[PDB]
Amino acid sequence: AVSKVYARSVYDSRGNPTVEVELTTEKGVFRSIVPSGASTGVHEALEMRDGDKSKWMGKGVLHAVKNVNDVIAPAFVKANIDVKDQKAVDDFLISLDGTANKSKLGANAILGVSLAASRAAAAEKNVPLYKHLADLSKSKTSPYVLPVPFLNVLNGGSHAGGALALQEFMIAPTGAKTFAEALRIGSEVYHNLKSLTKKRYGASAGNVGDEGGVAPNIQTAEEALDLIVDAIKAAGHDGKIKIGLDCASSEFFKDGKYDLDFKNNSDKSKWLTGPQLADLYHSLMKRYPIVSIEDPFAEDDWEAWSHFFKTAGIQIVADALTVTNPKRIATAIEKKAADALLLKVNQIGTLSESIKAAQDSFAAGWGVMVSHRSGETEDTFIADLVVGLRTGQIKTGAPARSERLAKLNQLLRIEEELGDNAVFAGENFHHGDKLL
Amino acid sequence: AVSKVYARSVYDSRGNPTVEVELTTEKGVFRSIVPSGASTGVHEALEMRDGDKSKWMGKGVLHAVKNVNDVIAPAFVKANIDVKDQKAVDDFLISLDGTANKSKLGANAILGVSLAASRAAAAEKNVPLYKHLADLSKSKTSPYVLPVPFLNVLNGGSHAGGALALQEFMIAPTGAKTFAEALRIGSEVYHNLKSLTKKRYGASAGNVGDEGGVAPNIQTAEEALDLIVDAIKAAGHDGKIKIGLDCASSEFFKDGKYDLDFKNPNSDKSKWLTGPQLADLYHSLMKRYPIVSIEDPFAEDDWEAWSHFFKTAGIQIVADALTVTNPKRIATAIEKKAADALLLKVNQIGTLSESIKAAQDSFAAGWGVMVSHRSGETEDTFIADLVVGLRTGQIKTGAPARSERLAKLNQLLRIEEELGDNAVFAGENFHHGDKLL
Ligand SMILES: O=C(O)[C@@H](CO)OP(=O)(O)O
Ligand SMILES: O=C(O)[C@@H](CO)OP(=O)(O)O
Ligand SMILES: [Mg+2]
Ligand SMILES: [Mg+2]
Ligand SMILES: [Mg+2]
Ligand SMILES: [Mg+2]
Ligand SMILES: [Mg+2]
Ligand SMILES: [Mg+2]
Ligand SMILES: [Mg+2]
Ligand SMILES: [Mg+2]
Ligand SMILES: [Mg+2]
Ligand SMILES: [Mg+2]
């Protein structure tokens, strides 16, 4: 049985506090750490911070930690829940908070308990976590699917200091035959990108943003994409590497329009309409091997999404639009706003709700890209999750900064363990769950 | 008994391959990952790289991985060594290689087995790793000592793109009462530093170097130190925060002179500094800023310059590239009175036992020891347990940003919690942490 639930404050990858949970059973101690976003969707479940300006500059999580130790822990232990029954674990937690957005206890109090229970369950079952997560999600397991990594090698927007408006420029080694090959050739592109960036924009441009990508002081998507295409050819991997974007356009949506110079005394006359921004993306799609675009329009700009999607012809990923929330996903499906869900467990707050979100997406013919947050930790949960969910695609950072490599390394280990019972999603990343 | 030893290629914090070792016993599977330096000393034990330009830019570790799987593993499993006997484990590995500088197998093949064995031994004894490391090093345990973290908040030299010659500018919250407080106030200074750096030098200057520190495109130590003092001020921690430097001066030493603009290929050779001129610079900084420690002030074989500076420095002087965690070179440094602290990097020498000897020799001479990360780190937390086990009272493991750095700092939070009243924070006594109480 679960004998102990304990929380403490630890530090995330940008130096902010976050919640770490330890769950003790007869099988040992199981730890989960809650990640933290910067460009959060306004519809995300509550991340509870202390707001005490004299400690951690208001970003303390002592209240959330207290909620685990003083509220969740005694009730959870008393309940004698079977950790194998994830739905019972999450129903209990959801009920204890009693609010839709988890505003009573905090999503960052609840999530760590939810995740740690799944680790405890995997141990009880003597299976690796990814096999247990496949069980919980009722995914196909013959074969397992290793994801294409979408590597965020050039950082802009909220994740890096500079003028660049679009948040993420990713490479996707869809042309590799194994995950290990994909990661190697991705790392090679990254290193070529680092050298080229220093050459073109100066030594300072080669330093990294929150997610490990280079952060050159550039003003347009075109020069960023030119750098990436240049890095791919320098590495000698043209045709094996595709490109993904996260526009994170909610970050520059104001008064019905889009400010591509929001990293500025920005010119209100230059602000773009939905149609104009769609024309911009189409122009980029024509000149670059772009296979996925995330949050091309704002989190509630439904008409703009639906209109773009009609003729996009590539994967359109909903992040802030859907916030890993089955209710908002249902709306996005009906409006035909996108065809892939960005899955972030801490946007909704429990594993069970995240699994439901993935299942609803798959049922609609959508893809699912499992995702890190920009404030990450040494935790590797999402590596096991992307495999368990059989999605065929993950974004977990550049191949730099170990809060990113921790996940990528874990996927190397998973690939090795599965051997002949796994296949790399490659060009079929979008429908990874349907593969075979 | 050890039933399996297995190695694989994984990625370090810079995106370069490195060696990960898993060692299996009755107690489970124990993992260690080898770190990788950038500003390496010429006297370091061999880091074996494949040099195949068509893979990983030539930086593959497949040869070292193969040395573990095809050479070390079958021999080690056959030997059936008691993992609790770290000295026997390491003597065995050192003997398998048979070379001074570990050039047969590579230090990056040997070290992973060395470290994972110690993890396995801790499990056998049912003790946390830091208690076992204290056993191996014969350190005092009443109380245990938590280190002052030297946080590298401004990155220059080899660790970041920019004109800044000096490699590391660190803050040391020696004025804190607990490790948790030290890390909190350190993080607060860091955040104030990031915001101020962006204000003074532009948004791009706030982006980070290899070790998580800001990398402003600045040319002089004085303005870097002004940024740090300004950040400490902004956070409201004046008096509680001290400063450490890593000059990594071997990186800019040429023709008996020091080039503080070495990353500029158009650097004027007339502006190059002599040993005494450099000593003057350091003394100028030490009077204007709360500097308590300086690492590698002079080049790795510029022995006379070290001895001369140390005679009147009056602060901690840390040997890194000079000593390369090597008992033989440490003995020379002790004799020459070149420094009074060792920077301890396990992968500079290649085994835990040799590293422990290096620390013991340093302590016996009345030196301090600062346990250190490499600039290419991993999610491995070994050094956190090592610094506590060795009772040194000081660690450098990066800025409070990038989780290859926070993983260690977070582990130190956990160790402090676990030890409760059986641990003290070194604080102002960081230099002689081993002698504390
Ligand atoms: O926008 C995103 O997709 C995420 C992950 O890159 O960033 P953040 O965690 O800051 O929301
Ligand atoms: O010089 C140093 O002290 C180390 C650690 O900061 O750097 P590197 O690992 O690059 O040698
Ligand atoms: Mg976001
Ligand atoms: Mg199963
Ligand atoms: Mg149009
Ligand atoms: Mg996004
Ligand atoms: Mg719900
Ligand atoms: Mg060095
Ligand atoms: Mg003991
Ligand atoms: Mg002088
Ligand atoms: Mg050094
Ligand atoms: Mg030796």
PDB file of N, CA, C and O in Angstrom, chain A residues 19-72:
ATOM      1  N   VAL A  19       7.363  21.945  -7.453  1.00  0.00           N
ATOM      2  CA  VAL A  19       6.948  20.935  -6.492  1.00  0.00           C
ATOM      3  C   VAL A  19       7.498  19.578  -6.887  1.00  0.00           C
ATOM      4  O   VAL A  19       7.376  19.154  -8.041  1.00  0.00           O
ATOM      5  N   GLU A  20       8.120  18.916  -5.920  1.00  0.00           N
ATOM      6  CA  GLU A  20       8.575  17.547  -6.079  1.00  0.00           C
ATOM      7  C   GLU A  20       7.794  16.691  -5.095  1.00  0.00           C
ATOM      8  O   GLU A  20       7.673  17.055  -3.926  1.00  0.00           O
ATOM      9  N   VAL A  21       7.252  15.576  -5.580  1.00  0.00           N
ATOM     10  CA  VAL A  21       6.482  14.643  -4.757  1.00  0.00           C
ATOM     11  C   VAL A  21       7.189  13.287  -4.650  1.00  0.00           C
ATOM     12  O   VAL A  21       7.688  12.750  -5.644  1.00  0.00           O
ATOM     13  N   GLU A  22       7.223  12.737  -3.440  1.00  0.00           N
ATOM     14  CA  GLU A  22       7.673  11.367  -3.234  1.00  0.00           C
ATOM     15  C   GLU A  22       6.558  10.521  -2.642  1.00  0.00           C
ATOM     16  O   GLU A  22       5.951  10.904  -1.640  1.00  0.00           O
ATOM     17  N   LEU A  23       6.279   9.400  -3.306  1.00  0.00           N
ATOM     18  CA  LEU A  23       5.281   8.433  -2.851  1.00  0.00           C
ATOM     19  C   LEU A  23       5.962   7.135  -2.453  1.00  0.00           C
ATOM     20  O   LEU A  23       6.694   6.540  -3.246  1.00  0.00           O
ATOM     21  N   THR A  24       5.713   6.694  -1.222  1.00  0.00           N
ATOM     22  CA  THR A  24       6.329   5.480  -0.701  1.00  0.00           C
ATOM     23  C   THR A  24       5.338   4.315  -0.697  1.00  0.00           C
ATOM     24  O   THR A  24       4.200   4.456  -0.242  1.00  0.00           O
ATOM     25  N   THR A  25       5.771   3.187  -1.252  1.00  0.00           N
ATOM     26  CA  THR A  25       5.027   1.933  -1.173  1.00  0.00           C
ATOM     27  C   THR A  25       5.974   0.846  -0.690  1.00  0.00           C
ATOM     28  O   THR A  25       7.144   1.112  -0.405  1.00  0.00           O
ATOM     29  N   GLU A  26       5.472  -0.385  -0.643  1.00  0.00           N
ATOM     30  CA  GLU A  26       6.286  -1.544  -0.280  1.00  0.00           C
ATOM     31  C   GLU A  26       7.435  -1.764  -1.274  1.00  0.00           C
ATOM     32  O   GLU A  26       8.447  -2.387  -0.933  1.00  0.00           O
ATOM     33  N   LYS A  27       7.287  -1.217  -2.485  1.00  0.00           N
ATOM     34  CA  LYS A  27       8.287  -1.375  -3.550  1.00  0.00           C
ATOM     35  C   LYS A  27       9.376  -0.294  -3.542  1.00  0.00           C
ATOM     36  O   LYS A  27      10.373  -0.408  -4.261  1.00  0.00           O
ATOM     37  N   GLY A  28       9.188   0.750  -2.741  1.00  0.00           N
ATOM     38  CA  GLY A  28      10.191   1.809  -2.627  1.00  0.00           C
ATOM     39  C   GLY A  28       9.613   3.206  -2.664  1.00  0.00           C
ATOM     40  O   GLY A  28       8.440   3.408  -2.349  1.00  0.00           O
ATOM     41  N   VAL A  29      10.450   4.172  -3.042  1.00  0.00           N
ATOM     42  CA  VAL A  29      10.062   5.580  -3.066  1.00  0.00           C
ATOM     43  C   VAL A  29      10.041   6.055  -4.513  1.00  0.00           C
ATOM     44  O   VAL A  29      10.995   5.841  -5.261  1.00  0.00           O
ATOM     45  N   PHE A  30       8.938   6.693  -4.894  1.00  0.00           N
ATOM     46  CA  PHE A  30       8.704   7.074  -6.279  1.00  0.00           C
ATOM     47  C   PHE A  30       8.490   8.570  -6.392  1.00  0.00           C
ATOM     48  O   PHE A  30       7.628   9.149  -5.723  1.00  0.00           O
ATOM     49  N   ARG A  31       9.292   9.187  -7.249  1.00  0.00           N
ATOM     50  CA  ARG A  31       9.424  10.632  -7.288  1.00  0.00           C
ATOM     51  C   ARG A  31       8.913  11.187  -8.610  1.00  0.00           C
ATOM     52  O   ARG A  31       9.201  10.634  -9.679  1.00  0.00           O
ATOM     53  N   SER A  32       8.140  12.263  -8.526  1.00  0.00           N
ATOM     54  CA  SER A  32       7.749  13.034  -9.701  1.00  0.00           C
ATOM     55  C   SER A  32       8.000  14.512  -9.453  1.00  0.00           C
ATOM     56  O   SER A  32       7.802  15.002  -8.342  1.00  0.00           O
ATOM     57  N   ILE A  33       8.435  15.229 -10.485  1.00  0.00           N
ATOM     58  CA  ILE A  33       8.656  16.669 -10.346  1.00  0.00           C
ATOM     59  C   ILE A  33       7.757  17.412 -11.339  1.00  0.00           C
ATOM     60  O   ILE A  33       7.658  17.020 -12.499  1.00  0.00           O
ATOM     61  N   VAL A  34       7.082  18.455 -10.865  1.00  0.00           N
ATOM     62  CA  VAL A  34       6.140  19.210 -11.689  1.00  0.00           C
ATOM     63  C   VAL A  34       6.880  20.262 -12.538  1.00  0.00           C
ATOM     64  O   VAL A  34       7.646  21.055 -11.993  1.00  0.00           O
ATOM     65  N   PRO A  35       6.650  20.276 -13.869  1.00  0.00           N
ATOM     66  CA  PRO A  35       7.285  21.289 -14.728  1.00  0.00           C
ATOM     67  C   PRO A  35       6.550  22.624 -14.655  1.00  0.00           C
ATOM     68  O   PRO A  35       5.513  22.715 -14.004  1.00  0.00           O
ATOM     69  N   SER A  36       7.073  23.649 -15.324  1.00  0.00           N
ATOM     70  CA  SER A  36       6.480  24.984 -15.258  1.00  0.00           C
ATOM     71  C   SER A  36       6.643  25.731 -16.583  1.00  0.00           C
ATOM     72  O   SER A  36       7.747  25.858 -17.094  1.00  0.00           O
ATOM     73  N   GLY A  37       5.540  26.227 -17.130  1.00  0.00           N
ATOM     74  CA  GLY A  37       5.593  26.971 -18.387  1.00  0.00           C
ATOM     75  C   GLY A  37       5.843  28.458 -18.235  1.00  0.00           C
ATOM     76  O   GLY A  37       5.646  29.029 -17.153  1.00  0.00           O
ATOM     77  N   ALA A  38       6.294  29.079 -19.326  1.00  0.00           N
ATOM     78  CA  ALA A  38       6.452  30.530 -19.408  1.00  0.00           C
ATOM     79  C   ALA A  38       5.313  31.123 -20.228  1.00  0.00           C
ATOM     80  O   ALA A  38       4.610  32.019 -19.765  1.00  0.00           O
ATOM     81  N   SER A  39       5.142  30.623 -21.449  1.00  0.00           N
ATOM     82  CA  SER A  39       4.048  31.057 -22.313  1.00  0.00           C
ATOM     83  C   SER A  39       2.818  30.191 -22.048  1.00  0.00           C
ATOM     84  O   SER A  39       2.351  29.437 -22.902  1.00  0.00           O
ATOM     85  N   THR A  40       2.291  30.300 -20.834  1.00  0.00           N
ATOM     86  CA  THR A  40       1.163  29.480 -20.442  1.00  0.00           C
ATOM     87  C   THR A  40      -0.110  29.924 -21.150  1.00  0.00           C
ATOM     88  O   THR A  40      -0.316  31.119 -21.395  1.00  0.00           O
ATOM     89  N   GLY A  41      -0.960  28.957 -21.471  1.00  0.00           N
ATOM     90  CA  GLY A  41      -2.304  29.263 -21.947  1.00  0.00           C
ATOM     91  C   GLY A  41      -3.117  29.813 -20.790  1.00  0.00           C
ATOM     92  O   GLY A  41      -2.984  29.368 -19.650  1.00  0.00           O
ATOM     93  N   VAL A  42      -3.965  30.789 -21.074  1.00  0.00           N
ATOM     94  CA  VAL A  42      -4.802  31.368 -20.024  1.00  0.00           C
ATOM     95  C   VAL A  42      -5.798  30.347 -19.459  1.00  0.00           C
ATOM     96  O   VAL A  42      -6.299  30.508 -18.337  1.00  0.00           O
ATOM     97  N   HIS A  43      -6.061  29.289 -20.227  1.00  0.00           N
ATOM     98  CA  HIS A  43      -7.014  28.245 -19.832  1.00  0.00           C
ATOM     99  C   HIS A  43      -6.392  27.054 -19.084  1.00  0.00           C
ATOM    100  O   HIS A  43      -7.083  26.093 -18.748  1.00  0.00           O
ATOM    101  N   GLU A  44      -5.087  27.119 -18.822  1.00  0.00           N
ATOM    102  CA  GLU A  44      -4.404  26.055 -18.086  1.00  0.00           C
ATOM    103  C   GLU A  44      -4.907  25.940 -16.649  1.00  0.00           C
ATOM    104  O   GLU A  44      -5.324  26.932 -16.054  1.00  0.00           O
ATOM    105  N   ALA A  45      -4.856  24.729 -16.094  1.00  0.00           N
ATOM    106  CA  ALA A  45      -5.185  24.506 -14.681  1.00  0.00           C
ATOM    107  C   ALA A  45      -4.229  25.299 -13.779  1.00  0.00           C
ATOM    108  O   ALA A  45      -3.090  25.571 -14.163  1.00  0.00           O
ATOM    109  N   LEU A  46      -4.687  25.674 -12.586  1.00  0.00           N
ATOM    110  CA  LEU A  46      -3.927  26.615 -11.746  1.00  0.00           C
ATOM    111  C   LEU A  46      -2.546  26.131 -11.304  1.00  0.00           C
ATOM    112  O   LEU A  46      -2.418  25.109 -10.628  1.00  0.00           O
ATOM    113  N   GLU A  47      -1.517  26.882 -11.688  1.00  0.00           N
ATOM    114  CA  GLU A  47      -0.204  26.740 -11.080  1.00  0.00           C
ATOM    115  C   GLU A  47      -0.179  27.709  -9.907  1.00  0.00           C
ATOM    116  O   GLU A  47      -0.197  28.928 -10.093  1.00  0.00           O
ATOM    117  N   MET A  48      -0.150  27.157  -8.698  1.00  0.00           N
ATOM    118  CA  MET A  48      -0.200  27.963  -7.490  1.00  0.00           C
ATOM    119  C   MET A  48       1.188  28.434  -7.064  1.00  0.00           C
ATOM    120  O   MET A  48       2.077  27.623  -6.792  1.00  0.00           O
ATOM    121  N   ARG A  49       1.351  29.753  -7.017  1.00  0.00           N
ATOM    122  CA  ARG A  49       2.580  30.385  -6.530  1.00  0.00           C
ATOM    123  C   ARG A  49       2.262  31.218  -5.295  1.00  0.00           C
ATOM    124  O   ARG A  49       1.122  31.665  -5.124  1.00  0.00           O
ATOM    125  N   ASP A  50       3.267  31.423  -4.446  1.00  0.00           N
ATOM    126  CA  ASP A  50       3.085  32.100  -3.153  1.00  0.00           C
ATOM    127  C   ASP A  50       2.875  33.618  -3.267  1.00  0.00           C
ATOM    128  O   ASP A  50       2.133  34.213  -2.471  1.00  0.00           O
ATOM    129  N   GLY A  51       3.534  34.240  -4.238  1.00  0.00           N
ATOM    130  CA  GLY A  51       3.436  35.688  -4.443  1.00  0.00           C
ATOM    131  C   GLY A  51       4.146  36.530  -3.390  1.00  0.00           C
ATOM    132  O   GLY A  51       3.944  37.745  -3.325  1.00  0.00           O
ATOM    133  N   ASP A  52       4.979  35.893  -2.569  1.00  0.00           N
ATOM    134  CA  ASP A  52       5.773  36.598  -1.559  1.00  0.00           C
ATOM    135  C   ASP A  52       7.019  37.202  -2.220  1.00  0.00           C
ATOM    136  O   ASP A  52       7.988  36.492  -2.485  1.00  0.00           O
ATOM    137  N   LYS A  53       6.994  38.511  -2.477  1.00  0.00           N
ATOM    138  CA  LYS A  53       8.065  39.166  -3.255  1.00  0.00           C
ATOM    139  C   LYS A  53       9.439  39.122  -2.581  1.00  0.00           C
ATOM    140  O   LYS A  53      10.460  39.380  -3.222  1.00  0.00           O
ATOM    141  N   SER A  54       9.460  38.780  -1.300  1.00  0.00           N
ATOM    142  CA  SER A  54      10.714  38.689  -0.546  1.00  0.00           C
ATOM    143  C   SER A  54      11.355  37.294  -0.600  1.00  0.00           C
ATOM    144  O   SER A  54      12.408  37.068   0.001  1.00  0.00           O
ATOM    145  N   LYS A  55      10.717  36.355  -1.299  1.00  0.00           N
ATOM    146  CA  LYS A  55      11.286  35.014  -1.461  1.00  0.00           C
ATOM    147  C   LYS A  55      11.059  34.520  -2.876  1.00  0.00           C
ATOM    148  O   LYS A  55       9.931  34.542  -3.366  1.00  0.00           O
ATOM    149  N   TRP A  56      12.137  34.086  -3.530  1.00  0.00           N
ATOM    150  CA  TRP A  56      12.067  33.572  -4.897  1.00  0.00           C
ATOM    151  C   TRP A  56      11.329  34.541  -5.815  1.00  0.00           C
ATOM    152  O   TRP A  56      10.687  34.138  -6.789  1.00  0.00           O
ATOM    153  N   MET A  57      11.417  35.818  -5.456  1.00  0.00           N
ATOM    154  CA  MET A  57      10.742  36.918  -6.139  1.00  0.00           C
ATOM    155  C   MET A  57       9.279  36.668  -6.478  1.00  0.00           C
ATOM    156  O   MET A  57       8.800  37.006  -7.569  1.00  0.00           O
ATOM    157  N   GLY A  58       8.584  36.084  -5.508  1.00  0.00           N
ATOM    158  CA  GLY A  58       7.156  35.858  -5.595  1.00  0.00           C
ATOM    159  C   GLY A  58       6.794  34.511  -6.175  1.00  0.00           C
ATOM    160  O   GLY A  58       5.615  34.177  -6.257  1.00  0.00           O
ATOM    161  N   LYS A  59       7.798  33.724  -6.565  1.00  0.00           N
ATOM    162  CA  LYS A  59       7.536  32.480  -7.299  1.00  0.00           C
ATOM    163  C   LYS A  59       7.613  31.206  -6.450  1.00  0.00           C
ATOM    164  O   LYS A  59       7.665  30.096  -6.985  1.00  0.00           O
ATOM    165  N   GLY A  60       7.590  31.370  -5.128  1.00  0.00           N
ATOM    166  CA  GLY A  60       7.617  30.237  -4.199  1.00  0.00           C
ATOM    167  C   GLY A  60       6.460  29.267  -4.400  1.00  0.00           C
ATOM    168  O   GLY A  60       5.403  29.641  -4.913  1.00  0.00           O
ATOM    169  N   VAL A  61       6.656  28.017  -4.004  1.00  0.00           N
ATOM    170  CA  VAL A  61       5.584  27.024  -4.111  1.00  0.00           C
ATOM    171  C   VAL A  61       5.280  26.367  -2.767  1.00  0.00           C
ATOM    172  O   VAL A  61       4.813  25.233  -2.711  1.00  0.00           O
ATOM    173  N   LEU A  62       5.544  27.094  -1.686  1.00  0.00           N
ATOM    174  CA  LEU A  62       5.353  26.563  -0.335  1.00  0.00           C
ATOM    175  C   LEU A  62       3.892  26.242  -0.028  1.00  0.00           C
ATOM    176  O   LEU A  62       3.615  25.313   0.716  1.00  0.00           O
ATOM    177  N   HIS A  63       2.978  27.014  -0.611  1.00  0.00           N
ATOM    178  CA  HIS A  63       1.545  26.765  -0.471  1.00  0.00           C
ATOM    179  C   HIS A  63       1.140  25.458  -1.140  1.00  0.00           C
ATOM    180  O   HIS A  63       0.389  24.675  -0.567  1.00  0.00           O
ATOM    181  N   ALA A  64       1.622  25.239  -2.364  1.00  0.00           N
ATOM    182  CA  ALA A  64       1.346  24.005  -3.090  1.00  0.00           C
ATOM    183  C   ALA A  64       1.924  22.808  -2.346  1.00  0.00           C
ATOM    184  O   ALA A  64       1.254  21.787  -2.186  1.00  0.00           O
ATOM    185  N   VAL A  65       3.167  22.954  -1.880  1.00  0.00           N
ATOM    186  CA  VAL A  65       3.837  21.920  -1.086  1.00  0.00           C
ATOM    187  C   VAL A  65       3.063  21.620   0.195  1.00  0.00           C
ATOM    188  O   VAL A  65       2.883  20.450   0.557  1.00  0.00           O
ATOM    189  N   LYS A  66       2.598  22.680   0.859  1.00  0.00           N
ATOM    190  CA  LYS A  66       1.788  22.546   2.067  1.00  0.00           C
ATOM    191  C   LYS A  66       0.485  21.809   1.771  1.00  0.00           C
ATOM    192  O   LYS A  66       0.090  20.925   2.523  1.00  0.00           O
ATOM    193  N   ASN A  67      -0.154  22.155   0.656  1.00  0.00           N
ATOM    194  CA  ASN A  67      -1.341  21.436   0.183  1.00  0.00           C
ATOM    195  C   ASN A  67      -1.148  19.926   0.022  1.00  0.00           C
ATOM    196  O   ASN A  67      -2.036  19.143   0.379  1.00  0.00           O
ATOM    197  N   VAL A  68      -0.003  19.515  -0.515  1.00  0.00           N
ATOM    198  CA  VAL A  68       0.338  18.096  -0.568  1.00  0.00           C
ATOM    199  C   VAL A  68       0.547  17.500   0.829  1.00  0.00           C
ATOM    200  O   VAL A  68      -0.045  16.481   1.149  1.00  0.00           O
ATOM    201  N   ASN A  69       1.397  18.120   1.647  1.00  0.00           N
ATOM    202  CA  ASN A  69       1.758  17.530   2.945  1.00  0.00           C
ATOM    203  C   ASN A  69       0.650  17.559   3.989  1.00  0.00           C
ATOM    204  O   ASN A  69       0.559  16.659   4.831  1.00  0.00           O
ATOM    205  N   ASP A  70      -0.182  18.591   3.936  1.00  0.00           N
ATOM    206  CA  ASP A  70      -1.178  18.816   4.993  1.00  0.00           C
ATOM    207  C   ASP A  70      -2.599  18.455   4.581  1.00  0.00           C
ATOM    208  O   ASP A  70      -3.458  18.243   5.441  1.00  0.00           O
ATOM    209  N   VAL A  71      -2.861  18.404   3.276  1.00  0.00           N
ATOM    210  CA  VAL A  71      -4.221  18.107   2.795  1.00  0.00           C
ATOM    211  C   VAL A  71      -4.272  16.778   2.033  1.00  0.00           C
ATOM    212  O   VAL A  71      -4.989  15.859   2.427  1.00  0.00           O
ATOM    213  N   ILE A  72      -3.502  16.679   0.953  1.00  0.00           N
ATOM    214  CA  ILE A  72      -3.539  15.496   0.099  1.00  0.00           C
ATOM    215  C   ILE A  72      -2.997  14.243   0.800  1.00  0.00           C
ATOM    216  O   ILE A  72      -3.658  13.208   0.819  1.00  0.00           O
TER     217      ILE A  72
END
